[PDB]
Design a protein around this ligand. Structure first.
Ligand SMILES: [Mg+2]
Ligand SMILES: [Mg+2]
Lengths: 1341, 251, 50, 277, 50
DNA sequence: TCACGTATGCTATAATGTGGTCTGACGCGG
DNA sequence: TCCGCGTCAGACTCGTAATTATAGCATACGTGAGG
RNA sequence: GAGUCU
């Protein structure tokens, strides 16, 4: 059932919901998105392929010459990731693209076969994505965050009572393309429709309709119905649709062929409507006064004269009806316009519309967007076509068209990027339907209207801008350039495409520093969604509606994961089982329910699709592949939860964990924690610095192993087999025949990344977690990362915690830790630190790096070598020189006093001064590495030459080992093939191996195997040389640096900082704290057994906080250690393998109805003792997120360890010896050391540098700056009365130049005298106001 | 001014002054050339634009953007609003003889006391140490006294201890909502790098120890030492100025 | 109101330091107003004793 | 009405007579001979050409109205030095001036620290070479790849490429919205801080007392040579101008003053202590 | 919200009860970051007049 | 009177009107 | 009634430093050194 | 731009 690395230490799982869908790869979105951007798709355009097809082919203004795209290719990277991180260069690939100059004949119509030139042109190096979903830019792992923006398509919206004073809800519409102008339709207070493009000025909505050739008559025959008015003899008649006289008062006596139905001033209810419809009433006689007010639909000209009696869209009257009847028209069409149902909007809009026909509308539209410029028929028609109706300037895209059509209730899903006439009108129609009553507005916060836009798509966008920048230079140089001489590459520029993509992988809000101070930080930062960025929100533009949690988020985005900064609802981590839809919306897995039986077929419902169905919750008890047991099932549909019957159930939540994120999945007992504290806990779990010793968590969830492995930091077995060679530096594994490929030897190599720097200057080391010659299964963890242990994630350490107050040393979340925790160096952290020494070129001359430095003691030059560089391993402290650098100085004017003092000693300052790299003030560690980058042609130090000697010889032995292990492994197979055919075992292995490849067999399939192994041996033999040459070349190669820079020495220190008062610690339920005192072991509390407590927390930091999960974690952690201490006791006593089998078996099957079932009869004797050995520190326990352990299960486990139900033990004061008055909650809580360490935070300054203009102190410890005394702080001393305290901080501590130097001298003289003046910042204000042209002067006493 | 590397850096005013001078010099030349008025007018329009952009960039029309795409900061901008001289460099200031650190409890302390780290207090009280070192006759000059303190000699800790007795320090927390957000204490030198705050004044600061940071200020002048001790001392400030009730209340 | 009573004060340096800096300075410039440094803001600015 | 400066100037030049073949020759005939009406209506008419040339030379140095202004100055010199005697057209001749006057004036104004014509035209040769090298060396060309293509010095290619490095503005934030910029970080190294200011006051007031300490003839001769008390820093031979009037006795007395002062620094507690400094 | 949470933190909230709890959690933490600026701006206006 | 960086000058096919972001809010004038 | 302009808490830590494109050659203009 | 205290 369980694999080999799982057999070493099984987590007792308290789950009860069988995981039908296993956790997917957590870094899927980063890899799959970028994979589309680079994968050259043949037809289904995506990424680079789509970019070229879209822009090319580009043709000239003469139309004779054009450039055409063929095909592109990615070249192998100049430096691999290994060497990019070192030299400090972008990990990118040459983009080589085939482009052809096709020229047409100007004499012939299109004489296509004239010149067909061809060449493969370089344009830019696109950055490549690593295996872990990172981009190495200038030697830094960086992650591009996926964006959540408003989807393209149509979306109807309404200002409720923000528009106007009356509170007319003005409904509106927006057609949003992926590229091109916006199209807004909106009402006004007075219910007239209007149109604005790109939110320009308001234009009558009928103006775009006229521009699309719609006559007045056609416009009314799109929105309005028809009422035919027949004039018979004398009495006027009207064609009735009974349904139209609906909830209306009868204005006249409605009477038909022979029956009065409704009287004057009487409401026509549903019954009067069916009375007329059952009697099948068609024409009704009506008064002539009834048309007074009706709007005539079409034009009615006199047949007799031939002139307008009444134009379309005009209100009729008795004099017009008289003229119509007598002229020769006894059948009038009329607009049907109800006040509440079918509203007259377009009709009143047409009277506001100043335009007459098609051409008048196009002028008016041209006059808006291009104002002042006289219009022409060419300019007006061409602009309007280039807005929405061009292949070039407009594109909704596939998502835009699909969302557009599905909004308008269309049949067609895919279609054209260009807006058609139907589209514009259909949208105006649906806008009017929403105003009428049927139809509602869509909300923007719905994730069905929020589309996810990952890296690949945003890289494609910026790459397209690169090709658009080249489009200018192509059309330019095609016209001017000769046709014969011109090749395509003379017209292309590589710098615009390089620059536009480099802007994205550099300047962009979404491209940023990978938070890698913890595997959990890395993996949840890659799973991040920001609604900020280009084409998205701003904090300026962010309301509260977008910020808060939305029904749709459920299962797509975690509601308990977001920063507590200004970006509180904007940034968001992705849920566990969430995925990007084919189009881009989010989607969540759901088990289908057919015939009431829950099928294991899973459907990833989109935000839109989820609303139809009813989804049962995961809480619902299945009959173990029957159906819902309970008759009533708790389910949710249409954004709400209620109870339902079983046959009505359509779907069910796949897992218990799906509403939460990766951060939150790792919180145990999240179910008992407040959302507010749970948020901070998941956010601080990411900030947990990995410790010296990776300790497992005793109280996990089980997601630990998913996170550690998917994060990429753990070295995992690509293929299973026996480990041939184990070492701290590397692991070499031989593969099993079944998975091993028949070609190569089949020996995998894992050179483990060793004590190396992170982006937060923390440590990264990979330790081998398998022994010499151990059998390993495929997909097992061969080596543990910095914050991982036997495959499981290890962010911090677990320890004996007692909740009780202590002399106010745990006052406000203040933490009291034992000396023993500090003594064990378990919370001690490694901080690798990078400091660079650069020799530049000044005006006076180039800078030297030698041990020959003016003004230096022998204490500083002692740790430097001949070249002037510190030895590897040498301990250094603030002041000590790491790299000796000296700079030229002009012959400076020595003041007579200095000239005396230099003539007194004799040692006069030389022409070259000094600027050596020295250890930063206060920091101190051991030098673990030094790396030297000399420019091609400049003088090399002898140390640099030793490093080249070191790298070369090491490279020779490293590739020797590559060919050696590969040769030995390759003949090992040949020997097995040679036995199958001509078995001569002992006698063939005596004489040399070198002539084994000549030996063959009779011609079988196994002879063909010998041939591939012999040819591949020579392939590796010839490849060994060209590989060794590449390493040798790169090592001899001068590293090409910035302008001015001659060479750089990068020194790496290693600080080993232990915990101290001020350091920030926390658990996983948002329970913060600062160490206050390291209490001696002698003083700490201890139980009757005698074992002292590690940490003493304040119990008053629990009820207020409402984070009770920390207490359940403590109780269960106690139970877990209780089992460990029992097994530890049984291993010390050395009882029996059958006894350990019984106790461990009863432990794993202790829960009421446990999900996992570990039969120990399957485990052999040797396997059990490896397991017991790891469980003795404490049995790791898994408490899934919402499907966790109950109190009863924890109390039951406490009885297995012979510990109290209560989880509270009688402790005794270490100082005195007497007992505390009551039992105290003690147990094991997994705590975490946060990155906020006090050695970094502490700062102080008396006197230092000053700013240029303000002349105030600098800011921050990074600049060694003074503290900001803001207006808030000014009001405090104002309020007290202390005006001297204030004036001190306003003048002599700040700007006053004469004040600050004089006061320093007063205090050294002893006299604490206030001798002030006036801030230079005021003098600046005066000159800045006078430069504005404003006389400001000091009118004196 | 020159950036460390060979690159230089300039204010946005230099870029706006250069537009004004170019268009003014070109205008003088086009008036010398007696060019048509059409050309002269365009140049007069551009002069108005460059002068108006120098004074207040974002006011008359679209603000003139430089290389970064953001608009060039004008003269008016360095007077106006938050980041103006007034609110940022005049009604509030960066201050000498100031530091900060992570605070922690001090339940042994008295209400008139606060734990002030060794190395913080050393850098804070530098001039007073050089002043005592000349009086006790240990250092001849200030440069000599500077190196004695930098080496952290045993004699220097004893003198540092001498200056700090009966010499108060001000402690501040953000946000400074009311005057009790700054209180004065007599320093107690301690072993670690973290400030120890008295539990009873925690209420005024709203300071919980879950990693709060508090700013340190030295009252240098004798006036300021007396103002710290008489007005702003913690023991002097017990009742709230808002309500006649004690803010110093056990929790 | 507060925002108006603050700007109504004769001290233009108090007014320009509060808000409306562009408008305060022009209305004071044309009136030829002289601020005699009355209140606390004025002396905090000039770096005097309160 | 339109209150934009650009679309207004473009409206004015629009209603301008586009000149034909012997219309250009007819006016330019009296233009060279010197006519009020000819120079204006030739220039007025040909403003439409300047805009098109200036439109293509954009997003490079100045905005756009700036290129038109300098472009109009090239059109004026085209009109002053046109030859109607030649059968060739004006639009041919004036296109040479407008491309020239704009190219040459951009080179000067586009940069903050004024870059001259030679250094810029030098640079353009290196830039066009770089594009040709880049297409066949995929990655950008190095300064040695460019230097080795032209067979010219590596320092000369480095010198000119270093001048191409653009200037970062002080007011530009590192932060984003409104955190801190480069003025908020960069120090005024010219004004030394009170610690460095008071050390030279204490060093030099310590020396004023050590002058009165040494012998009367020794502190006279030593001070007036270095220019400590005197007005001008003289040499061993020039101390003779005062009263010394010696070459040997001045050198013995100068060094005798410094030897007695070296023992004054070993006793006060400096010598090797103040040697590090 | 019309549906309140019957359960407590000792008993544990289920999947939906937590999801309902988050509506009110985020809105509170939202006012801690955003609405403090309306309140703090009152402090500023009051100081400038008095 | 040259040496050296800097500046001004002229090129004659014809060519003659320009082309980044798209969403805040609540108050208070003109 | 609509457009325009004006406000929108207080400190702290980190982190990095980008792009384009302007032809080519001959006399003219200024300062400093050497004969 | 990502954080820390409110
Ligand atoms: Mg607290
Ligand atoms: Mg706190």
């Amino acid at each position: 059932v369980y694999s080999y690395t799982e057999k070493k230490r099984i987590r007792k799982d308290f789950g009860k919901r069988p995981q039908v869908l296993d956790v997917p790869y957590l870094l899927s979105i980063q890899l799959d998105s970028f994979q589309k951007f680079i994968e050259q798709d043949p037809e289904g355009q995506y990424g680079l392929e789509a970019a070229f097809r879209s822009v090319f082919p580009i043709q000239s203004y003469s139309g004779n010459s054009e450039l055409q795209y063929v095909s592109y290719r990615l070249g192998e990277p100049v430096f691999d990731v290994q060497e990019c991180q070192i030299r400090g260069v972008t990990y990118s690939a040459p983009l080589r693209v085939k482009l052809r100059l096709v020229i047409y004949e100007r004499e012939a119509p299109e004489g296509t076969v004239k010149d067909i030139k061809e060449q493969e042109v370089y344009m830019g190096e696109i950055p490549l994505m690593t295996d872990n979903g990172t981009f190495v830019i200038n030697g830094t792992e960086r992650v591009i965050v996926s964006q959540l923006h408003r989807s393209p398509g149509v979306f109807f919206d309404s200002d409720k009572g923000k528009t106007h004073s009356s509170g007319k809800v003005l409904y509106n519409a927006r057609i949003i393309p992926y590229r091109g102008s916006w199209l807004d339709f909106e009402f006004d207070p007075k219910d007239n429709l209007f149109v604005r493009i790109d939110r320009r000025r308001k234009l009558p909505a009928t103006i775009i309709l006229r521009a699309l050739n719609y006559t007045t008559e056609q416009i009314l025959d799109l929105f309005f119905e028809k009422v035919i008015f027949e004039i018979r003899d004398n009495k006027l008649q009207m064609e009735l649709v009974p349904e139209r006289l609906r909830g209306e008062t009868a204005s006249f006596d409605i009477e038909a062929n022979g029956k009065v139905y409704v009287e004057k001033g009487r409401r026509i209810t549903a019954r009067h409507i069916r009375q007329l419809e059952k009697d099948d009433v068609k024409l009704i006689e009506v008064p002539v006064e009834y048309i007074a007010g009706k709007v005539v639909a079409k034009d009615y000209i006199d047949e007799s004269t031939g002139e307008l009696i009444c134009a379309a869209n005009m209100e009729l009257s008795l004099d017009l009806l008289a003229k119509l009847s007598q002229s020769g028209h006894k059948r009038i069409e009329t607009l049907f316009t109800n006040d509440l149902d079918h509203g007259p909007y377009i009709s009143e809009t047409l009277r506001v519309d100043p335009t007459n026909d098609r051409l008048s509308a196009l002028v008016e539209i041209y006059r808006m967007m291009r104002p002042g410029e006289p219009p022409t028929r060419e300019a007006a028609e061409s602009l309007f076509e280039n807005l929405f109706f061009s292949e070039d300037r407009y594109d909704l895209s596939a998502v835009g068209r699909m969302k557009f059509n599905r909004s308008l209730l269309r049949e067609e899903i895919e279609g054209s990027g260009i807006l058609s006439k139907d589209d514009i009108i259909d949208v105006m129609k649906k806008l009017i339907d929403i105003r009428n009553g049927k139809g509602e507005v869509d909300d923007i916060d719905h994730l069905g209207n929020r589309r996810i836009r990952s890296v690949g798509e945003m890289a494609e966008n910026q790459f397209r801008v690169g090709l658009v920048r080249v489009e200018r230079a192509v059309k330019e140089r095609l016209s001017l350039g000769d046709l014969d001489t011109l090749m395509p590459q003379d017209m292309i520029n590589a710098k615009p495409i390089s620059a536009a993509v480099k802007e994205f992988f550099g300047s962009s809000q979404l491209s940023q520093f990978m938070d890698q101070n913890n595997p959990l930080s890395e993996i949840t930062h890659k799973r991040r969604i920001s609604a900020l960025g280009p084409g998205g929100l701003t904090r300026e533009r962010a309301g509260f509606e977008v910020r808060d949690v939305h029904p749709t988020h459920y299962g797509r985005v975690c509601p308990i994961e977001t920063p507590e900064g200004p970006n509180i609802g904007l940034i968001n981590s992705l849920s566990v089982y969430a995925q990007t839809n084919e189009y881009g919306f989010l989607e969540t897995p759901y088990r289908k329910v057919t015939d009431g039986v829950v099928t294991d077929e899973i459907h990833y419902l989109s935000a839109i699709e989820e609303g139809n169905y009813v989804i049962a919750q995961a809480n619902s008890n299945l009959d173990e592949e029957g159906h819902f047991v309970e008759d009533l099932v708790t389910c949710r549909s249409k954004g709400e939860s209620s109870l339902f019957s079983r046959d009505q159930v359509d779907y069910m939540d796949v897992s218990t964990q799906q509403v939460v994120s990766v951060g939150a999945s790792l919180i145990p007992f999240l179910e008992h924690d407040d959302a507010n504290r749970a948020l901070m806990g998941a956010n601080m779990q990411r900030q947990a610095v990995p410790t010296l010793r990776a300790d497992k968590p005793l109280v996990g969830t089980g997601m630990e192993r998913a996170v550690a492995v998917d994060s990429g930091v753990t070295a995992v077995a690509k293929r299973g087999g026996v480990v041939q060679y184990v070492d701290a530096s590397r692991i070499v594994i031989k593969v099993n025949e079944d998975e091993m490929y028949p070609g190569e030897a089949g020996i995998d190599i894992y050179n483990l990344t060793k004590y190396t720097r992170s982006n937060q200057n923390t440590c990264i080391n990979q330790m081998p977690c398998v022994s010499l010659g151990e059998p390993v299964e495929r997909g097992d963890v061969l080596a543990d990362g910095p914050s991982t242990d036997l495959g499981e994630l290890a962010l911090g350490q677990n320890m004996r915690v007692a909740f009780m107050p202590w002399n106010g040393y745990n006052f406000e979340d203040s933490i009291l830790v034992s000396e023993r925790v500090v003594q064990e160096d378990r919370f001690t952290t490694i901080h690798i630190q990078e400091l660079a020494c650069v020799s530049r070129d000044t005006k006076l001359g180039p800078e030297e790096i030698t041990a020959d430095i003016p003004n230096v003691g022998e204490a500083a030059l002692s740790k430097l070598d001949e070249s002037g560089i510190v030895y590897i391993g040498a301990e250094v402290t603030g002041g000590d020189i790491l790299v000796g650098k000296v700079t030229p100085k002009g012959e400076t004017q020595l003041t007579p006093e200095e000239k005396l003092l230099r003539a007194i000693f004799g040692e006069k300052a030389s022409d070259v001064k000094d600027s050596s790299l020295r250890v930063p003030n206060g920091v101190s560690g051991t030098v673990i590495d030094v790396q030297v980058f000399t420019r091609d042609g400049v003088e090399k130090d002898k140390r640099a030459l030793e490093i080249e000697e070191m790298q070369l010889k090491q490279a020779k032995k490293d590739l020797s080992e590559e060919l050696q292990i590969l040769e030995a492994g390759l003949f090992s197979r040949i020997r097995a093939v040679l036995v199958a055919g001509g078995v001569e075992a002992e006698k063939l292995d005596k004489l040399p191996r070198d002539r084994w490849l000549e030996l063959g067999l009779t011609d079988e399939e196994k002879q063909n195997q010998l041939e591939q192994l012999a040819e591949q041996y020579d392939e590796l033999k010839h490849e060994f040389e060209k590989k060794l040459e590449a390493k040798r070349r790169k090592i001899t190669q001068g590293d090409d640096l910035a302008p001015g820079v001659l060479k750089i020495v990068k020194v790496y220190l290693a600080v080993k900082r232990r915990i101290q008062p001020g350091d920030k610690m926390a658990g996983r339920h948002g329970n913060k704290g600062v160490i206050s005192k390291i209490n001696p072991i002698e003083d700490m509390p201890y139980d009757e057994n005698g074992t002292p407590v590690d940490i003493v927390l304040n119990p008053l930091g629990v009820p207020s906080r409402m984070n009770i999960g920390q207490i359940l974690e403590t109780h269960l952690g106690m139970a877990a250690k209780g089992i460990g201490d029992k097994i530890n006791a049984m291993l010390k006593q050395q009882q029996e393998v059958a006894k350990l089998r019984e106790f461990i078996q009863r432990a794993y099957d202790l829960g009421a109805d446990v999900r996992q079932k570990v039969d120990l009869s399957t485990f052999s004797d040797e396997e059990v003792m490896r397991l017991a050995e790891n469980l003795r520190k404490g049995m790791p326990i898994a408490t899934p997120v919402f499907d966790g352990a109950k109190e009863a299960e924890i109390k039951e486990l406490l009885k297995l360890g012979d510990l109290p139900t209560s989880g509270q033990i009688r402790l005794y004061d270490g100082r005195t010896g007497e007992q505390f008055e009551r039992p105290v909650t003690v147990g094991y809580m997994y705590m975490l050391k946060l990155n906020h360490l006090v050695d970094d935070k502490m700062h102080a300054r008396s006197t230092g540098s000053y700013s240029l203009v303000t002349q105030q102190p600098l800011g921050g410890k990074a600049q060694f700056g003074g503290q900001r005394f803001g207006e808030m702080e000014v009001w405090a001393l104002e309020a007290y009365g202390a005006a001297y305290t204030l004036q001190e901080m306003l003048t002599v501590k700040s700007d006053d130049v004469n004040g600050r130097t004089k006061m320093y001298k007063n205090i050294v003289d002893g006299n604490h005298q206030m001798e002030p003046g006036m801030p230079e910042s005021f003098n600046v204000l005066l000159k800045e106001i006078r430069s504005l042209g404003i006389n400001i002067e000091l009118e004196d006493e | 001014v020159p950036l460390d590397g060979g690159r230089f850096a300039t204010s946005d005013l230099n870029d706006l002054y250069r537009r004004v001078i170019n268009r003014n010099n070109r205008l003088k030349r086009l008036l010398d050339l007696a060019a048509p008025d059409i050309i002269v007018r365009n140049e007069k329009r551009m002069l108005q634009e460059a002068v108006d952009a120098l004074l207040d960039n974002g006011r008359r029309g679209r603000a003139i953007t430089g290389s970064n795409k953001r608009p060039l900061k004008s003269l008016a901008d360095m007077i106006k609003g938050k980041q103006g001289r007034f609110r940022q460099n005049l009604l509030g200031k960066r201050v000498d003889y100031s530091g900060r650190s992570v605070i922690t409890v001090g339940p042994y302390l008295r209400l008139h006391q606060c734990g002030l780290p060794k190395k913080m207090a050393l850098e804070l009280f530098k001039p007073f140490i050089y002043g005592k070192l000349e009086l006790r006759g240990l250092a001849t000059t200030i440069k000599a006294a500077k190196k004695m303190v930098e080496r952290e000699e045993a004699v220097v800790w004893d003198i540092l201890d001498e200056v700090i007795r009966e010499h108060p320090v001000l402690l501040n927390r953000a946000p400074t909502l009311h005057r009790l957000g700054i209180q004065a204490f007599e320093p107690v030198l301690i072993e670690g790098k973290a400030i120890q705050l008295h539990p009873l004044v925690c209420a005024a600061y709203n300071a919980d120890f879950d990693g709060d940071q508090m700013a340190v200020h030295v009252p240098l002048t004798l006036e300021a030492q007396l103002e710290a001790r008489a007005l702003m001392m913690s023991t002097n400030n017990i009742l709230s100025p808002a309500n006649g009730e004690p803010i110093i209340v056990p929790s | 109101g507060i925002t108006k009573a603050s700007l109504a004060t004769e001290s233009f340096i108090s007014a320009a330091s509060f808000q409306e800096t562009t408008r305060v300075l022009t209305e004071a410039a044309v009136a030829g107003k002289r601020d005699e440094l009355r209140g606390l803001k004025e002396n905090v600015i000039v770096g005097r004793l309160i | 009405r339109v209150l934009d400066a650009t679309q207004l100037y473009l409206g004015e030049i629009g209603y301008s007579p586009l000149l034909t073949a012997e219309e250009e020759v007819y006016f330019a005939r009296r233009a060279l001979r010197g006519d009020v009406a000819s120079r204006r209506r030739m220039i007025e008419s040909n403003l439409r050409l300047v805009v098109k040339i200036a439109r293509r030379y954009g997003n490079r140095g100045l905005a756009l109205l700036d290129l038109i202004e300098e472009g109009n100055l090239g059109l004026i010199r085209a009109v002053e030095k046109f030859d109607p005697e030649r059968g060739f057209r004006f639009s041919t001749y004036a296109t040479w001036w407008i491309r020239q006057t704009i190219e040459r004036a951009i080179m000067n104004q586009t940069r903050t620290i004024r870059l001259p014509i030679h250094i810029v035209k030098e640079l353009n040769v290196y830039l066009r070479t770089a594009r040709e090298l880049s297409h066949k060396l995929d990655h950008e060309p190095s300064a040695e790849e460019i230097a080795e293509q032209l067979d010219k010095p590596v320092d000369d290619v480095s010198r000119m490429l270093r001048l191409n490095e653009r200037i970062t503005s002080v007011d530009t934030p590192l932060g984003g919205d409104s955190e801190k910029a480069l003025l908020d970080i960069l120090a005024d190294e010219k004004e030394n801080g009170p610690e460095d200011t008071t050390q030279d006051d204490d060093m030099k007031q310590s020396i004023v007392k050590w002058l009165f300490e040494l012998n009367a003839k020794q502190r006279e001769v030593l001070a007036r040579r270095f220019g400590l008390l005197g007005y001008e820093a003289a040499t061993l031979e020039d101390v003779g101008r005062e009263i010394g009037l010696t070459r040997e006795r001045v050198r013995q007395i100068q060094v005798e003053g410094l030897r007695r002062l070296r023992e004054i620094l070993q006793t006060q507690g400096l010598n090797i202590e103040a040697l590090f400094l | 919200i019309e549906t309140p949470i019957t359960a407590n933190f000792r008993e544990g909230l289920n999947v939906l009860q937590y999801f309902i709890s988050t509506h009110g959690a985020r809105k509170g933490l939202a006012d801690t970051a955003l609405k403090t600026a309306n309140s703090g701006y009152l402090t500023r206006r009051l100081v400038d007049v008095a």
